[PDB]
Scaffold this active site. Structure first.
Site, PDB file in Angstrom:
ATOM      1  N   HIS A 130      27.512  45.034  19.064  1.00  0.00           N
ATOM      2  CA  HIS A 130      27.642  43.943  18.112  1.00  0.00           C
ATOM      3  C   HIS A 130      28.061  42.675  18.852  1.00  0.00           C
ATOM      4  O   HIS A 130      27.394  41.646  18.754  1.00  0.00           O
ATOM      5  CB  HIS A 130      28.686  44.279  17.033  1.00  0.00           C
ATOM      6  CG  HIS A 130      28.925  43.170  16.054  1.00  0.00           C
ATOM      7  ND1 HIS A 130      28.200  43.030  14.890  1.00  0.00           N
ATOM      8  CD2 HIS A 130      29.782  42.120  16.089  1.00  0.00           C
ATOM      9  CE1 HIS A 130      28.602  41.944  14.249  1.00  0.00           C
ATOM     10  NE2 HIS A 130      29.561  41.373  14.956  1.00  0.00           N
ATOM     11  N   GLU A 131      29.164  42.753  19.596  1.00  0.00           N
ATOM     12  CA  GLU A 131      29.673  41.603  20.335  1.00  0.00           C
ATOM     13  C   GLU A 131      28.714  41.174  21.443  1.00  0.00           C
ATOM     14  O   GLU A 131      28.569  39.984  21.722  1.00  0.00           O
ATOM     15  CB  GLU A 131      31.049  41.910  20.911  1.00  0.00           C
ATOM     16  CG  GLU A 131      32.098  42.329  19.876  1.00  0.00           C
ATOM     17  CD  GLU A 131      32.187  41.367  18.707  1.00  0.00           C
ATOM     18  OE1 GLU A 131      32.112  40.147  18.934  1.00  0.00           O
ATOM     19  OE2 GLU A 131      32.341  41.834  17.556  1.00  0.00           O
TER      20      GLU A 131
ATOM     21  N   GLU B 210      25.543  35.584  13.578  1.00  0.00           N
ATOM     22  CA  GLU B 210      25.558  36.911  12.984  1.00  0.00           C
ATOM     23  C   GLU B 210      24.197  37.580  13.097  1.00  0.00           C
ATOM     24  O   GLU B 210      24.108  38.802  13.270  1.00  0.00           O
ATOM     25  CB  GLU B 210      25.986  36.830  11.523  1.00  0.00           C
ATOM     26  CG  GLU B 210      27.493  36.797  11.332  1.00  0.00           C
ATOM     27  CD  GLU B 210      28.171  38.029  11.896  1.00  0.00           C
ATOM     28  OE1 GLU B 210      27.903  39.141  11.396  1.00  0.00           O
ATOM     29  OE2 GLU B 210      28.967  37.883  12.851  1.00  0.00           O
TER      30      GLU B 210
ATOM     31  N   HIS C 181      26.460  38.635  20.300  1.00  0.00           N
ATOM     32  CA  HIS C 181      27.005  37.279  20.289  1.00  0.00           C
ATOM     33  C   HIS C 181      27.051  36.739  21.716  1.00  0.00           C
ATOM     34  O   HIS C 181      26.658  35.607  21.978  1.00  0.00           O
ATOM     35  CB  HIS C 181      28.431  37.266  19.733  1.00  0.00           C
ATOM     36  CG  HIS C 181      28.521  37.384  18.245  1.00  0.00           C
ATOM     37  ND1 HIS C 181      27.941  36.472  17.389  1.00  0.00           N
ATOM     38  CD2 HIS C 181      29.186  38.265  17.460  1.00  0.00           C
ATOM     39  CE1 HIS C 181      28.249  36.783  16.142  1.00  0.00           C
ATOM     40  NE2 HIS C 181      29.004  37.867  16.157  1.00  0.00           N
TER      41      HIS C 181
END
Lengths: 497, 497
Positions: free
Chosen positions: B267-268, B297, B271
Site C-alpha cells: 500500500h505504502e 490513494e 505512495h
C-alpha cells in the site's frame, strides 16, 4: 517565575523560533549520518543551507537585537534572566562581526580548499593543498581583525572556539606539560609497566557481540535508553541534543580492537549526560546547554579516561566482555586494563593514548600561532610539523598523511579550534581531584556501578548552569579555581608511576 | 527549460525557504514515529508548532503573495509555470480564508472534542462526545461559508481536501455503487466462492520472518532501498516524502494475520513510487509531488488491491512465504489467494475488504452531507449511522464503538475527507483497465516480477506531472476521460463472479 521581566519574555518568545530551527537542524544532521539513503544528500543539503541562513537572519533581525540591547540595560534582572542576555549578546556580536561578503568568501575558499585537501591526501602531495592553505591563513588573519583581539591576533580565533580563552592561557598550560609531562612520558616508556601494544588490539568481534557490551555499559551508567536517549551507529561517533529530553549518541563497530567502540561510546555518554542534566526550567531558552567545546570535552574525557580506563571500570565490565567475547577466555582483567592503558608515541592524533595525546595538540597550537600571529608560508609548514613531532614524540612523519594532512580542520578554516581538546583533557583530571574530595571512595563507586552520586555531583557543579556563565566564570563557580595543567600531570603520575 | 519567466524565478527562489521547512517538518514527523525516545515529545511538539507558524508566515509574506499575484496576471507562461501559479494560489487562498480567531476556536474545540471522543469511545458512551460533535458541525458550516461554494456548502469542504471535487461528482460515483456494486456484493456473499474468514488470520509469526518477506517483495518491485528510500516500523504505516530522492515508508507487525503487514507495505509502496517518480527538474518547487489525496490513494490502491490481491501476485509471493513461515506447510497458493480476497460485511472501516469497503465511506458521505447541508443534531447521527450500515451491509452496530465512534475524523474536524478514499479505490480500477490495453500482458508481468514497464507507464501517465494539472484535468490528460465508477464495478465482477 524564573523568567518574569516583560522584555526577557518577549525575547524568549522570539527565540523559540530560533530554537525550533535548531531542533530541526540537529535532527537533519543526526538523520544524515544515521538513516538517510545516500542519494538524499542533495535535497538534505539545500534544506540545511536554507535553515542556516534563516536562523542567522532571525538572530540579526533589528527587532531581536534591539530587545536584547534594551534588556542589557535593565537593572532589575535575576541571575537566570541575566544569563539569557549575556548569552545572546555574545552570539549577536559574533554573528555580525563578519561582513556578509566575507562570510561568502570564507565559504567559497574553504569549500575549494577542502576539495584540494582531499586531492592532496589522495596523492600524498601537499603542493595541491598548499596554495589553498596560504589563502586560509590570510582569511584567518582577516577574521582575527574582524572579531578584534586585544593582545594578539591568535587570541581572537581562540576566543571564537572557547569564549574567554587567550593565547596566554594555552601557552601556560602547554608550558607546564613540556616541563613535567614530557619527562613523565619518557620514564613511562622505558619503565615498562604499561605496554606499547596488546594482542587484544587484534582480536576480532561480530557487531552483535560488542553492541550488547555497549548497551550493558550504558544501562549501568543509567542511560535513559528509549526514554530520553538513543544509541545508534554512524561513520563517526558524536552526540546531538534534540532537547533536554532527547539526547542521542552514536558509535561505530570496526570489527576488531574492541576498546575502540567502548571508550568511544563512553566518551559520547560523557557529552550526552551534560545535555541530559540541563535545568528543565531553561527549556527552549539560550541558557540551556553546554557552555563551550572545552567544557563539553572535560565531560567526555572525565567519563572516557578518568573512569573508562580505570581498573575498577575494567573490573566492573570484565564479566560482560567474557560473556560476549569468545576470545576473552584467554585474557584476564589485568590484560584488559593494560590493553586499555597502552602508552605509545605515534603519528595519528585520533589514535594517541592519553599521555602522548596532548603533544599532538601542542604541535598544532605552535604552528597555528605562527600562522595567525606571524607571517609563515604554507610551503614551510610540513617540515615544521615534522620537527615538532620528532622533538616531542621522538618520531618523524614519513608521509604527508602521517603528518600535516591528518586532519581536515585547517581546510575547513577551523584555526584556533585544536586547543579545546587539551582543555577537556586537563579539566577532566582537575575535576577528578575535586569530586574526589566530596567522594573519597570514588573508585569503589565505579567498581560497584554506583554512578548516581557521581552524575549528581557533575550536575550540581557543572551541568545545571548551562550557559548562564562563560567558561572561566563557570569553572571558578564549580571548583573555586582556574584551569591548571598541574592536576593532569599528577593524574598521569598517580596512574603510571 | 522548464522555468524561464523572471517572476516565476523569483517565486521559486523564495519558495526554497518554505520548501526547506517542509523538509524539516517531514523529518521531524517521521522521526517522531520511528526513532524518538518517548519523552522527546514535549520539545518536538513546540518545535513543530513554531515551524508551522513560520511556513504559514512565509506563504503569506507580503513580497511573496505579491509576486504570485503578478505571475497570475502574465499571459505567456508555459504549463509548468502555470502549474506553479495555480498550486501556490490555492494554498494562499486556503491559508487566508479563515480569520486568525476562527483558527483558535477550531483548534481549541478540536483537541477538546478529540479528547472527549477518546473517552466516549473507550466507554461506549456517545453522550460524552455528542455536544462536541454539535460544535464541530457548526464549525464545518462556518468553514464552508468562509471558503465559498456555488452549489452546496459541502462542496467547499470536499474541495478543501481534494482540489476541484464537488458533491455532485461524489454523489454520482456513489449512485453507481449503490445500484450496481450492492447486488454484486450480495451475489458474491450468497455464493461464497470467496470466504468471510480464513485460518491464516489466526496464524502467529515473529517479526523477523515477516520483515524478510516484506523486504523481498519491495526488492522485487525494485524499491530503491538504501539509495532513495527506506522501510522502518511505526505505530501506523505511512509514507513520507523528504525529497524526490529520499522517500520513506513504514509498516507494522501485528504478530499474526500476515496479510496485514504485506498489503500495508505494498500500500505504502504505492505512495512511495508516486513520489519517487516525480520529475527531478521540479525538485524544490511547489509543483513537485502528488497532486491530491485522491490521486495518491489511487496509487496505493493500485498496487495494494489491483496487484497485491491478484492471483499472479500470490503465485510470485508463494515461495517466499513457504520459506519464512513454518505454518505455510499446510496451505496451498489457493488458500493464500482466498485469504487475500476475503469478503465480509463488518463494522470497522479500517478492516473492510475491497468489495464492502466503499460502503463504509458512502454512509459517512451521506451523513456528512446532511450535517453540513441541513440542521441535524448530533444526537440523531448514531441511529442514522446504523440504518445505513444495515441498509448497505446487512449488519447493525450494537455498541457505539462499532458504529459512529469508530474513527477520530469528525472529532478532529475532518469533514469532507472520507470520499477521497473512494476516489482512490475507483481510480485504481479505472487505471487497471487502461494500462491493460497498453500492456496487454500486464498480469503475466506481475507473475514474473517485471514491474519496470508497469512503473514506467505509471510514470508517463501520472507521476511525471506532479501538481502541474488539477486532478480532473490530469485524468483527462492521462486517460482521456473522467472519473468513472463503472470500472470498479467491472473489476469486482471480473474478480469474483
Amino acid at each position: 517565575e524564573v523568567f518574569q521581566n516583560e522584555t526577557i519574555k518577549q525575547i524568549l518568545a522570539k527565540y523559540r523560533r530560533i530554537w525550533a530551527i535548531g531542533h530541526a537542524q540537529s535532527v537533519l544532521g543526526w538523520d544524515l549520518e544515521v538513516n538517510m539513503p545516500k542519494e538524499g544528500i542533495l535535497e538534505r543539503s539545500v534544506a540545511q543551507g536554507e535553515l542556516s541562513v534563516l536562523s542567522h537572519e532571525l538572530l540579526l533581525h533589528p527587532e531581536f537585537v534591539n530587545l536584547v540591547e534594551k534588556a542589557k540595560g535593565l537593572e532589575n534582572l535575576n541571575e537566570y534572566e541575566r544569563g539569557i542576555v549575556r548569552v545572546l549578546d555574545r552570539s549577536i556580536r559574533i554573528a555580525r562581526a563578519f561582513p556578509p561578503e566575507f562570510i561568502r568568501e570564507v565559504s567559497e575558499t574553504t569549500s575549494l580548499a577542502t576539495k584540494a585537501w582531499e586531492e592532496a591526501k589522495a596523492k600524498d602531495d601537499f603542493s595541491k593543498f598548499e596554495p589553498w592553505l596560504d589563502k586560509i591563513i590570510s582569511l584567518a588573519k582577516r577574521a582575527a581583525e574582524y572579531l578584534g583581539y586585544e593582545e594578539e591576533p591568535y587570541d581572537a580565533l581562540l576566543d571564537l572556539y572557547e569564549e574567554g580563552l587567550r593565547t596566554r592561557d594555552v601557552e601556560k598550560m602547554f608550558e607546564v606539560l613540556e616541563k613535567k609531562l614530557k619527562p613523565l612520558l619518557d620514564k613511562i616508556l622505558e619503565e615498562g609497566k604499561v605496554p606499547r601494544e596488546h594482542p587484544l588490539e587484534k582480536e576480532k568481534y561480530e557487531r552483535e557481540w560488542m553492541e550488547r557490551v555497549n548497551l550493558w555499559i550504558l544501562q549501568k551508567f543509567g542511560f535513559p535508553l528509549g526514554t530520553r536517549a538513543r544509541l545508534d551507529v554512524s561513520a563517526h561517533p558524536f552526540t546531538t541534543e534534540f532537547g533536554i529530553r532527547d539526547v542521542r549518541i552514536t558509535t561505530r563497530y570496526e570489527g576488531y580492537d574492541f576498546r575502540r567502540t567502548i571508550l568511544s561510546t563512553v566518551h559520547e555518554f560523557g557529552h550526552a549526560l551534560y545535555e541530559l542534566q540541563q535545568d528543565e526550567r531553561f527549556m527552549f531558552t539560550p541558557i540551556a546547554g553546554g557552555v563551550s567545546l572545552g567544557i563539553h570535552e572535560s565531560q567526555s574525557r572525565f567519563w572516557e579516561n578518568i573512569i573508562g580506563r580505570s581498573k575498577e571500570f575494567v573490573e566492573l565490565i570484565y564479566p560482560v566482555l567474557k560473556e560476549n567475547l569468545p576470545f576473552m577466555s584467554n585474557y584476564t582483567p589485568e590484560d584488559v586494563y593494560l590493553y586499555f592503558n597502552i602508552v605509545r608515541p605515534d603519528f595519528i592524533r585520533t589514535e594517541a593514548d592519553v599521555v602522548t595525546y596532548n603533544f599532538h595538540i601542542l604541535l598544532r597550537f605552535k604552528l597555528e600561532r605562527l600562522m595567525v600571529s606571524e607571517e609563515i608560508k604554507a610551503k614551510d609548514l610540513p617540515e615544521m610539523w615534522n620537527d615538532e613531532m620528532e622533538r616531542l614524540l621522538g618520531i618523524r612523519p614519513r608521509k604527508y598523511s602521517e603528518g600535516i594532512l591528518q586532519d581536515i580542520h585547517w581546510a575547513h578554516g577551523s584555526i584556533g579550534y585544536f586547543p579545546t581538546y587539551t582543555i577537556g583533557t586537563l579539566l577532566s583530571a582537575q575535576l577528578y581531584y575535586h569530586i574526589k574530595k566530596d567522594i573519597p571512595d570514588f573508585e569503589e563507586k565505579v567498581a560497584k556501578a554506583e554512578f548516581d552520586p557521581i552524575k549528581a555531583w557533575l550536575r550540581e557543579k557543572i551541568h545545571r548552569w548551562g550557559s548562564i556563565y562563560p567558561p572561566k566564570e563557570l569553572l571558578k563557580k564549580a571548583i573555586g579555581e582556574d584551569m591548571d595543567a598541574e592536576y593532569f600531570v599528577r593524574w598521569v603520575k598517580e596512574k603510571y608511576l
